[model samples]
Target chain A: EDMEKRANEVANLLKTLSHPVRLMLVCTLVEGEFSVGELEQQIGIGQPTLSQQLGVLRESGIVETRRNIKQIFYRLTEAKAAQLVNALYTIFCAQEKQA
Target chain B: TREDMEKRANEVANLLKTLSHPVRLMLVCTLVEGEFSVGELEQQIGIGQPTLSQQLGVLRESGIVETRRNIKQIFYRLTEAKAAQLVNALYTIFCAQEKQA
Candidate 1:
Protein backbone atom coordinates (compact mmCIF):
# COMPACT_ATOMS: atom_id res chain seq x y z
CA GLU A 1 0.00 0.00 0.00
CA ASP A 2 2.65 2.46 1.07
CA MET A 3 4.92 1.20 -1.68
CA GLU A 4 2.30 1.95 -4.28
CA LYS A 5 1.86 5.45 -2.87
CA ARG A 6 5.58 6.08 -3.03
CA ALA A 7 5.71 4.81 -6.57
CA ASN A 8 2.93 7.16 -7.57
CA GLU A 9 4.82 10.07 -6.08
CA VAL A 10 7.97 9.19 -7.99
CA ALA A 11 5.98 8.68 -11.13
CA ASN A 12 4.60 12.18 -10.79
CA LEU A 13 8.12 13.49 -10.48
CA LEU A 14 9.11 11.66 -13.64
CA LYS A 15 6.08 13.05 -15.44
CA THR A 16 7.16 16.55 -14.60
CA LEU A 17 10.51 15.89 -16.25
CA SER A 18 9.08 14.12 -19.30
CA HIS A 19 9.87 16.89 -21.76
CA PRO A 20 13.12 17.56 -23.63
CA VAL A 21 13.50 21.21 -22.75
CA ARG A 22 12.35 20.60 -19.17
CA LEU A 23 14.77 17.70 -18.70
CA MET A 24 17.60 19.77 -20.12
CA LEU A 25 16.76 22.61 -17.79
CA VAL A 26 16.84 20.32 -14.76
CA CYS A 27 20.08 18.74 -15.91
CA THR A 28 21.74 22.12 -16.26
CA LEU A 29 20.42 23.23 -12.88
CA VAL A 30 21.90 20.10 -11.35
CA GLU A 31 25.33 21.70 -11.75
CA GLY A 32 24.46 24.87 -9.79
CA GLU A 33 22.39 28.02 -9.90
CA PHE A 34 22.15 29.76 -13.26
CA SER A 35 20.65 33.10 -14.09
CA VAL A 36 18.21 33.34 -16.98
CA GLY A 37 20.88 34.64 -19.31
CA GLU A 38 23.37 32.04 -18.16
CA LEU A 39 20.86 29.26 -18.76
CA GLU A 40 20.06 30.71 -22.17
CA GLN A 41 23.76 30.77 -23.04
CA GLN A 42 24.38 27.27 -21.72
CA ILE A 43 21.29 25.60 -23.11
CA GLY A 44 21.30 27.39 -26.49
CA ILE A 45 17.51 27.21 -26.87
CA GLY A 46 15.45 30.26 -27.77
CA GLN A 47 14.58 32.49 -24.85
CA PRO A 48 10.87 31.91 -25.19
CA THR A 49 11.22 28.13 -25.33
CA LEU A 50 13.68 28.13 -22.45
CA SER A 51 11.51 30.38 -20.33
CA GLN A 52 8.47 28.19 -20.93
CA GLN A 53 10.33 25.07 -19.87
CA LEU A 54 11.74 26.86 -16.86
CA GLY A 55 8.20 27.85 -16.03
CA VAL A 56 7.22 24.20 -16.04
CA LEU A 57 10.10 23.30 -13.76
CA ARG A 58 9.25 26.09 -11.36
CA GLU A 59 5.57 25.24 -11.30
CA SER A 60 6.32 21.58 -10.65
CA GLY A 61 8.44 22.56 -7.62
CA ILE A 62 11.56 20.97 -9.02
CA VAL A 63 13.31 24.31 -9.02
CA GLU A 64 13.19 27.69 -7.27
CA THR A 65 14.31 31.11 -8.30
CA ARG A 66 15.83 34.14 -6.67
CA ARG A 67 16.00 37.67 -7.95
CA ASN A 68 19.56 38.97 -8.19
CA ILE A 69 19.24 42.62 -9.09
CA LYS A 70 17.23 42.61 -12.33
CA GLN A 71 18.01 39.01 -13.19
CA ILE A 72 16.45 35.80 -11.90
CA PHE A 73 18.53 32.75 -11.06
CA TYR A 74 17.24 29.19 -10.93
CA ARG A 75 18.45 26.33 -8.81
CA LEU A 76 17.37 22.79 -8.09
CA THR A 77 15.63 23.27 -4.73
CA GLU A 78 13.54 20.10 -4.46
CA ALA A 79 15.53 17.41 -2.61
CA LYS A 80 14.21 14.41 -4.50
CA ALA A 81 14.64 16.25 -7.75
CA ALA A 82 18.25 16.97 -6.88
CA GLN A 83 18.84 13.37 -5.91
CA LEU A 84 17.39 12.09 -9.16
CA VAL A 85 19.39 14.59 -11.18
CA ASN A 86 22.60 13.61 -9.42
CA ALA A 87 21.89 9.97 -10.12
CA LEU A 88 21.24 10.82 -13.74
CA TYR A 89 24.46 12.77 -13.96
CA THR A 90 26.38 9.87 -12.57
CA ILE A 91 24.84 7.38 -14.97
CA PHE A 92 24.58 9.52 -18.10
CA CYS A 93 27.02 12.39 -17.96
CA ALA A 94 29.90 11.11 -15.89
CA GLN A 95 29.94 7.74 -17.62
CA GLU A 96 29.85 9.31 -21.04
CA LYS A 97 32.79 11.56 -20.21
CA GLN A 98 34.79 8.65 -18.91
CA ALA A 99 34.00 6.47 -21.89
CA THR B 1 23.46 24.68 -30.61
CA ARG B 2 22.85 21.91 -28.07
CA GLU B 3 20.79 20.03 -30.64
CA ASP B 4 22.48 16.79 -29.62
CA MET B 5 21.70 17.48 -25.99
CA GLU B 6 18.09 18.18 -26.91
CA LYS B 7 17.85 14.89 -28.78
CA ARG B 8 19.28 12.98 -25.85
CA ALA B 9 16.95 14.77 -23.47
CA ASN B 10 14.00 13.70 -25.62
CA GLU B 11 15.18 10.12 -25.53
CA VAL B 12 15.71 10.21 -21.78
CA ALA B 13 12.31 11.78 -21.15
CA ASN B 14 10.60 9.10 -23.24
CA LEU B 15 12.41 6.44 -21.23
CA LEU B 16 11.27 8.06 -17.99
CA LYS B 17 7.65 8.08 -19.16
CA THR B 18 7.86 4.43 -20.13
CA LEU B 19 8.92 3.50 -16.60
CA SER B 20 6.65 6.03 -14.94
CA HIS B 21 3.99 3.57 -13.79
CA PRO B 22 4.23 1.80 -10.44
CA VAL B 23 4.14 -1.69 -11.89
CA ARG B 24 6.40 -0.80 -14.78
CA LEU B 25 8.89 0.90 -12.47
CA MET B 26 8.90 -2.04 -10.10
CA LEU B 27 9.33 -4.48 -12.94
CA VAL B 28 12.32 -2.56 -14.29
CA CYS B 29 13.81 -2.30 -10.82
CA THR B 30 13.51 -6.07 -10.44
CA LEU B 31 15.16 -6.63 -13.81
CA VAL B 32 18.08 -4.28 -13.09
CA GLU B 33 20.22 -6.96 -11.53
CA GLY B 34 19.44 -9.74 -14.02
CA GLU B 35 16.76 -11.60 -15.92
CA PHE B 36 13.51 -12.81 -14.36
CA SER B 37 10.98 -15.32 -15.60
CA VAL B 38 7.28 -14.47 -15.58
CA GLY B 39 6.59 -16.59 -12.48
CA GLU B 40 9.53 -15.08 -10.64
CA LEU B 41 8.28 -11.57 -11.38
CA GLU B 42 4.77 -12.53 -10.22
CA GLN B 43 6.09 -13.79 -6.91
CA GLN B 44 8.33 -10.78 -6.38
CA ILE B 45 5.90 -8.06 -7.46
CA GLY B 46 2.75 -9.73 -6.03
CA ILE B 47 0.57 -8.45 -8.88
CA GLY B 48 -2.24 -10.30 -10.65
CA GLN B 49 -1.15 -12.12 -13.82
CA PRO B 50 -3.30 -10.01 -16.11
CA THR B 51 -1.98 -6.71 -14.78
CA LEU B 52 1.57 -7.98 -14.78
CA SER B 53 1.31 -9.13 -18.35
CA GLN B 54 -0.23 -5.85 -19.37
CA GLN B 55 2.59 -3.81 -17.83
CA LEU B 56 5.18 -6.19 -19.20
CA GLY B 57 3.67 -5.75 -22.62
CA VAL B 58 4.10 -1.99 -22.30
CA LEU B 59 7.75 -2.44 -21.43
CA ARG B 60 8.26 -4.83 -24.32
CA GLU B 61 6.72 -2.43 -26.80
CA SER B 62 8.95 0.33 -25.48
CA GLY B 63 12.10 -1.70 -26.29
CA ILE B 64 13.21 -1.52 -22.71
CA VAL B 65 13.14 -5.25 -22.17
CA GLU B 66 13.53 -8.40 -24.25
CA THR B 67 12.19 -11.86 -23.61
CA ARG B 68 13.76 -15.27 -23.94
CA ARG B 69 11.75 -18.43 -23.91
CA ASN B 70 12.90 -21.60 -22.22
CA ILE B 71 10.38 -24.30 -22.98
CA LYS B 72 7.25 -23.32 -21.07
CA GLN B 73 8.65 -20.24 -19.29
CA ILE B 74 9.43 -16.73 -20.52
CA PHE B 75 12.28 -14.70 -19.03
CA TYR B 76 12.69 -10.97 -19.38
CA ARG B 77 15.83 -8.84 -19.17
CA LEU B 78 16.59 -5.17 -19.50
CA THR B 79 17.88 -4.84 -23.06
CA GLU B 80 18.12 -1.10 -23.59
CA ALA B 81 21.34 0.44 -22.34
CA LYS B 82 19.74 3.74 -21.42
CA ALA B 83 16.85 2.10 -19.57
CA ALA B 84 19.23 -0.14 -17.66
CA GLN B 85 21.31 2.88 -16.69
CA LEU B 86 18.22 4.75 -15.52
CA VAL B 87 17.01 1.74 -13.53
CA ASN B 88 20.39 1.42 -11.80
CA ALA B 89 20.29 5.13 -10.99
CA LEU B 90 16.75 4.81 -9.61
CA TYR B 91 17.80 1.92 -7.38
CA THR B 92 20.75 3.86 -6.01
CA ILE B 93 18.73 6.97 -5.21
CA PHE B 94 15.50 5.29 -4.06
CA CYS B 95 16.42 1.86 -2.68
CA ALA B 96 20.10 1.88 -1.65
CA GLN B 97 19.63 3.70 1.65
CA GLU B 98 16.87 1.40 2.85
CA LYS B 99 19.11 -1.60 2.52
CA GLN B 100 21.65 -0.04 4.91
CA ALA B 101 19.15 0.12 7.75
Candidate 2:
Protein backbone atom coordinates (compact mmCIF):
# COMPACT_ATOMS: atom_id res chain seq x y z
CA GLU A 1 0.00 0.00 0.00
CA ASP A 2 2.69 2.45 0.98
CA MET A 3 4.84 1.40 -1.95
CA GLU A 4 1.99 1.93 -4.40
CA LYS A 5 1.30 5.42 -3.08
CA ARG A 6 4.99 6.25 -3.13
CA ALA A 7 5.30 5.01 -6.70
CA ASN A 8 2.44 7.22 -7.82
CA GLU A 9 3.91 10.21 -6.01
CA VAL A 10 7.39 9.69 -7.40
CA ALA A 11 6.07 9.05 -10.91
CA ASN A 12 4.05 12.25 -10.77
CA LEU A 13 7.15 14.25 -9.85
CA LEU A 14 9.23 12.54 -12.54
CA LYS A 15 6.61 13.46 -15.12
CA THR A 16 7.04 17.08 -14.10
CA LEU A 17 10.84 16.85 -14.31
CA SER A 18 10.79 14.97 -17.58
CA HIS A 19 10.58 18.06 -19.75
CA PRO A 20 13.79 19.64 -21.08
CA VAL A 21 12.80 23.20 -20.33
CA ARG A 22 11.64 22.37 -16.82
CA LEU A 23 14.66 20.20 -16.09
CA MET A 24 17.03 22.87 -17.36
CA LEU A 25 15.17 25.52 -15.45
CA VAL A 26 15.45 23.67 -12.14
CA CYS A 27 19.02 22.62 -12.81
CA THR A 28 19.98 26.20 -13.52
CA LEU A 29 18.40 27.41 -10.33
CA VAL A 30 20.20 24.68 -8.46
CA GLU A 31 23.38 26.67 -8.95
CA GLY A 32 21.70 29.71 -7.37
CA GLU A 33 18.36 31.47 -7.25
CA PHE A 34 16.94 33.42 -10.19
CA SER A 35 14.00 35.63 -11.03
CA VAL A 36 11.60 34.91 -13.88
CA GLY A 37 13.37 37.23 -16.29
CA GLU A 38 16.77 35.97 -15.29
CA LEU A 39 15.58 32.44 -15.84
CA GLU A 40 14.27 33.38 -19.28
CA GLN A 41 17.63 34.88 -20.22
CA GLN A 42 19.68 32.05 -18.77
CA ILE A 43 17.56 29.32 -20.32
CA GLY A 44 17.12 31.20 -23.64
CA ILE A 45 13.45 30.38 -23.60
CA GLY A 46 10.86 33.04 -24.25
CA GLN A 47 8.84 34.56 -21.42
CA PRO A 48 5.64 32.74 -22.32
CA THR A 49 7.27 29.34 -22.66
CA LEU A 50 9.36 29.81 -19.58
CA SER A 51 6.36 31.03 -17.63
CA GLN A 52 4.41 27.99 -18.74
CA GLN A 53 7.19 25.70 -17.61
CA LEU A 54 7.43 27.58 -14.34
CA GLY A 55 3.71 27.16 -13.87
CA VAL A 56 4.09 23.43 -14.34
CA LEU A 57 6.97 23.19 -11.89
CA ARG A 58 5.17 25.35 -9.37
CA GLU A 59 2.04 23.23 -9.60
CA SER A 60 4.14 20.11 -9.04
CA GLY A 61 5.09 21.57 -5.62
CA ILE A 62 8.81 21.02 -6.04
CA VAL A 63 9.54 24.64 -6.90
CA GLU A 64 8.86 27.66 -4.71
CA THR A 65 8.50 31.25 -5.79
CA ARG A 66 8.52 34.63 -4.10
CA ARG A 67 6.97 37.76 -5.54
CA ASN A 68 9.14 40.76 -4.94
CA ILE A 69 8.61 44.35 -6.12
CA LYS A 70 9.48 43.62 -9.75
CA GLN A 71 10.03 39.90 -10.09
CA ILE A 72 9.26 36.39 -8.89
CA PHE A 73 12.28 34.42 -7.72
CA TYR A 74 12.26 30.67 -8.23
CA ARG A 75 14.12 27.76 -6.66
CA LEU A 76 13.71 24.12 -5.81
CA THR A 77 12.02 23.65 -2.43
CA GLU A 78 12.10 19.89 -2.02
CA ALA A 79 15.05 17.70 -1.14
CA LYS A 80 14.02 15.14 -3.74
CA ALA A 81 13.85 17.84 -6.39
CA ALA A 82 17.35 18.99 -5.49
CA GLN A 83 18.63 15.43 -5.50
CA LEU A 84 17.11 14.69 -8.90
CA VAL A 85 18.29 17.96 -10.40
CA ASN A 86 21.75 17.45 -8.95
CA ALA A 87 21.89 13.96 -10.41
CA LEU A 88 20.87 15.38 -13.78
CA TYR A 89 23.23 18.34 -13.59
CA THR A 90 26.12 16.09 -12.65
CA ILE A 91 25.36 13.68 -15.45
CA PHE A 92 24.53 16.34 -18.06
CA CYS A 93 26.16 19.67 -17.28
CA ALA A 94 29.22 18.58 -15.30
CA GLN A 95 30.11 16.13 -18.04
CA GLU A 96 29.72 18.87 -20.61
CA LYS A 97 31.98 21.14 -18.61
CA GLN A 98 34.69 18.46 -18.53
CA ALA A 99 34.22 17.76 -22.24
CA THR B 1 29.16 32.11 -29.61
CA ARG B 2 28.55 28.97 -27.66
CA GLU B 3 26.96 25.86 -29.19
CA ASP B 4 23.25 25.06 -29.13
CA MET B 5 22.22 24.26 -25.55
CA GLU B 6 18.69 23.52 -26.69
CA LYS B 7 19.90 20.46 -28.56
CA ARG B 8 21.65 19.16 -25.49
CA ALA B 9 18.70 20.03 -23.27
CA ASN B 10 16.32 18.31 -25.63
CA GLU B 11 18.43 15.18 -25.67
CA VAL B 12 18.51 15.05 -21.89
CA ALA B 13 14.80 15.85 -21.67
CA ASN B 14 14.00 13.02 -24.04
CA LEU B 15 15.98 10.69 -21.83
CA LEU B 16 14.07 11.92 -18.76
CA LYS B 17 10.71 11.49 -20.47
CA THR B 18 11.68 7.92 -21.31
CA LEU B 19 12.41 7.24 -17.67
CA SER B 20 9.26 9.05 -16.47
CA HIS B 21 6.94 6.15 -17.08
CA PRO B 22 6.22 3.93 -14.04
CA VAL B 23 6.82 0.53 -15.54
CA ARG B 24 9.84 1.76 -17.43
CA LEU B 25 11.20 3.33 -14.24
CA MET B 26 10.70 0.05 -12.40
CA LEU B 27 12.43 -1.81 -15.20
CA VAL B 28 15.48 0.43 -15.01
CA CYS B 29 15.43 0.19 -11.21
CA THR B 30 15.40 -3.60 -11.45
CA LEU B 31 18.16 -3.67 -14.04
CA VAL B 32 20.37 -1.74 -11.65
CA GLU B 33 20.75 -4.83 -9.50
CA GLY B 34 21.85 -7.01 -12.43
CA GLU B 35 20.83 -8.17 -15.88
CA PHE B 36 17.71 -10.22 -16.32
CA SER B 37 16.20 -12.41 -19.00
CA VAL B 38 13.02 -11.36 -20.78
CA GLY B 39 10.96 -13.93 -18.90
CA GLU B 40 12.47 -12.87 -15.59
CA LEU B 41 11.75 -9.20 -16.23
CA GLU B 42 8.24 -10.06 -17.31
CA GLN B 43 7.71 -12.00 -14.15
CA GLN B 44 9.17 -9.36 -11.90
CA ILE B 45 7.22 -6.52 -13.48
CA GLY B 46 4.03 -8.61 -13.56
CA ILE B 47 3.12 -7.34 -16.99
CA GLY B 48 2.43 -9.65 -19.91
CA GLN B 49 5.07 -10.16 -22.59
CA PRO B 50 3.31 -8.04 -25.21
CA THR B 51 3.14 -4.94 -23.03
CA LEU B 52 6.54 -5.65 -21.55
CA SER B 53 8.09 -5.95 -25.00
CA GLN B 54 6.52 -2.68 -26.04
CA GLN B 55 8.09 -0.92 -23.05
CA LEU B 56 11.39 -2.74 -23.63
CA GLY B 57 11.35 -1.56 -27.22
CA VAL B 58 11.04 2.03 -26.07
CA LEU B 59 13.97 1.59 -23.67
CA ARG B 60 16.00 -0.02 -26.44
CA GLU B 61 15.22 2.85 -28.80
CA SER B 62 16.50 5.24 -26.13
CA GLY B 63 19.77 3.21 -25.93
CA ILE B 64 19.31 2.74 -22.18
CA VAL B 65 18.93 -1.01 -22.28
CA GLU B 66 20.92 -3.38 -24.47
CA THR B 67 20.08 -7.01 -25.13
CA ARG B 68 22.18 -10.11 -25.49
CA ARG B 69 21.14 -13.20 -27.37
CA ASN B 70 21.99 -16.47 -25.71
CA ILE B 71 20.80 -19.52 -27.62
CA LYS B 72 16.97 -19.25 -27.44
CA GLN B 73 16.95 -16.76 -24.57
CA ILE B 74 17.46 -13.00 -24.45
CA PHE B 75 18.97 -10.88 -21.65
CA TYR B 76 18.81 -7.14 -21.01
CA ARG B 77 20.84 -4.71 -18.91
CA LEU B 78 21.40 -1.02 -18.41
CA THR B 79 24.70 -0.29 -20.23
CA GLU B 80 25.27 3.48 -20.10
CA ALA B 81 26.96 5.40 -17.32
CA LYS B 82 24.52 8.29 -17.41
CA ALA B 83 21.63 5.84 -17.36
CA ALA B 84 23.11 3.77 -14.55
CA GLN B 85 23.72 6.85 -12.43
CA LEU B 86 20.21 8.16 -12.95
CA VAL B 87 18.62 4.79 -12.24
CA ASN B 88 20.66 4.14 -9.12
CA ALA B 89 19.85 7.58 -7.75
CA LEU B 90 16.15 7.16 -8.46
CA TYR B 91 15.99 3.74 -6.87
CA THR B 92 17.80 4.91 -3.80
CA ILE B 93 15.75 8.06 -3.50
CA PHE B 94 12.29 6.87 -4.54
CA CYS B 95 11.93 3.10 -4.31
CA ALA B 96 12.90 2.17 -0.78
CA GLN B 97 11.10 -1.13 -1.00
CA GLU B 98 13.73 -3.11 0.83
CA LYS B 99 14.56 -1.94 4.32
CA GLN B 100 18.18 -0.93 4.76
CA ALA B 101 19.59 -3.50 7.15
Candidate 2 - CAPRI tier?
medium
Residue pairs of candidate 2 with colliding backbone atoms:
none
Highest DockQ: give the candidate number. 1
lDDT of 1 by residue, A1-99 (tens): 555666677788888888877877888887888988898887787767888888888888888998868777899986677889777666654543333
**What are the models' TM-scores?**
0.85, 0.85
Q: Cα lDDT for residue A58, model 1?
A: 83
At residue B59, give the lDDT of candidate 1: 92
Kindly state the number of residue pairs that clash in model 1: 0
lDDT of 2 by residue, B1-101 (tens): 11456666777777777787777877888788888998898787676767788988999988889998778678999977567777788888777564476
Candidate 1 per-residue lDDT, tens place, B18-55, comes to: 87898887788778768998889988778877899999
Fnat scores for every prediction: 0.63, 0.48
Clashing pairs in 1: none
